[PDB]
From a paper:
We characterized the fitness peaks of four orthologous fluorescent proteins with a broad range of sequence divergence. To complement the available data on the avGFP fitness peak (Sarkisyan et al., 2016; GFP from Aequorea victoria, Hydrozoa), we experimentally characterized three additional GFP sequences, each with a different degree of sequence divergence from avGFP: amacGFP (Aequorea macrodactyla, Hydrozoa), cgreGFP (Clytia gregaria, Hydrozoa), and ppluGPF2 (Pontellina plumata, Copepoda), with 18%, 59%, and 82% sequence divergence, respectively. Mutations in the chromophore eliminated fluorescence and mutations of buried amino acid residues had a stronger effect than mutations of residues on the protein surface. In all four fitness peaks, a threshold effect of accumulating multiple random mutations was found, such that the median level of fluorescence dropped sharply once a certain number of mutations was reached.
We solved the crystal structure of amacGFP and analysed it along with structures already available for other proteins. By contrast, the fitness peaks of amacGFP and ppluGFP2 were substantially flatter, with each tolerating twice as many mutations. By contrast, few genotypes with >5 mutations in flat fitness peaks required epistasis to explain their fluorescence level, with amacGFP requiring almost no epistasis at all. Indeed, the two closest sequences (82% identity), derived from the same genus, are the sharp, epistatic avGFP peak and the flat, non-epistatic amacGFP peak. Therefore, we performed an array of assays aimed at the biophysical characterisation of the four wildtype proteins and an additional genotype, amacGFP:V12L, which differed from amacGFP by the V12L mutation that was extremely common in the amacGFP mutant library. Specifically, we observed that the most mutationally fragile protein, cgreGFP is also the most kinetically unstable protein and the most mutationally robust protein, ppluGFP2, was also the most kinetically stable. These data tentatively suggest that the shape of the GFP fitness peaks, as characterized by mutational robustness, may in part be shaped by the underlying protein stability. Peak analysis is consistent with the following oligomeric states for each gene: amacGFP: primarily mono- and dimeric, with small fractions of tri- and/or tetramers; avGFP: primarily monomeric, with a small dimeric fraction; cgreGFP: primarily dimeric, with a small tetrameric fraction; ppluGFP2: primarily tetrameric, with a small fraction forming large aggregates or oligomers. The propensity for aggregation also appears variable between the genotypes, with amacGFP showing the highest aggregation of non-fluorescent genotypes. Interestingly, the V12L mutation in amacGFP:V12L appears to have shifted the distribution of the mutation effects, substantially increasing the effect of mutations on the barrel lid in proximity to residue 12, without impacting the overall mutational robustness.
Numbering used by the authors: -1 to 64, 68 to 228
The structure:
């Protein structure tokens, strides 16, 4: 490794802990995720549990909120890997996600090492949602399509501006758009890699655990940097 010290933290399998605090339309909920990341493979394997009971939104609408440091950057692209460069002190990731003809998520997380573990600690607020819309009415299929994530430098803030659209299939036919606006800024003082325009290619498989009695999501994701 020769472009950032933080890259060295991602050799082999890294434990992952995700803690999400949410509040949408008067419904408070918590999600806890535990799993492993293999950045050399761009692979995540996580199981998520709603620790507060029933999730009051569809699991697919939380995927993007619930760690881009696990992307596979090919050698010729590794100079562009902001996410690993910020480690171990990590980065703030902030989004507004606009659901077309419905409400928005406002999210803010810290992604950083806590000892051996890569942690995403994140808050979500859901504003202006329709009680009978596709989100609060649970009208979205239990799946997640392939998407590209568009990364741009933000030299002014020593970080990133990121944008992409998620297409959520509606039960019975139709697509619900979720427009993602994102920023990343470092938490620490160390040097970071400010990239050129590039994108991540993201494949996701969500499933259920036969044995699990809690509201939950089994999660498999592969993502790669392309330029």
């Amino acid at each position: 490794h020769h472009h950032s010290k933080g890259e060295e933290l991602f050799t082999g399998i890294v434990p992952v802990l995700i803690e999400l605090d949410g509040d949408v339309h008067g419904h408070k909920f918590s999600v806890r995720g535990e799993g492993e990341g293999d950045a050399d493979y761009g692979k995540l394997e996580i199981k998520f549990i709603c620790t507060t009971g029933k999730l009051p939104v569809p699991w697919p609408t939380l995927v993007t909120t619930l760690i881009l440091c696990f992307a596979r950057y090919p050698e010729h692209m590794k100079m562009n890997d902001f996410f690993k460069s910020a480690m171990p002190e990590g980065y703030i990731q902030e989004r507004t996600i606009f659901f077309q003809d419905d409400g928005k998520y406002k999210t803010r997380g810290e992604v950083k090492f806590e000892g051996d573990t890569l942690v995403n600690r994140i808050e979500l607020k859901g504003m202006d949602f329709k009680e009978d819309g596709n989100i609060l009415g649970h009208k979205l299929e239990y799946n997640f399509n392939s998407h590209n994530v568009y990364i741009m430098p933000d030299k002014a803030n020593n970080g990133l501006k990121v944008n992409f659209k998620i297409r959520h299939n509606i039960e019975g036919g139709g697509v619900q758009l979720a427009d993602h606006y994102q920023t990343n800024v470092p938490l620490g003082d160390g040097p970071v890699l400010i990239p050129i325009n590039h994108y991540l290619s993201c494949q996701t498989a969500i499933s259920k655990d036969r044995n699990e009695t809690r509201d939950h999501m089994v999660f498999l994701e592969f993502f790669s940097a392309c330029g």
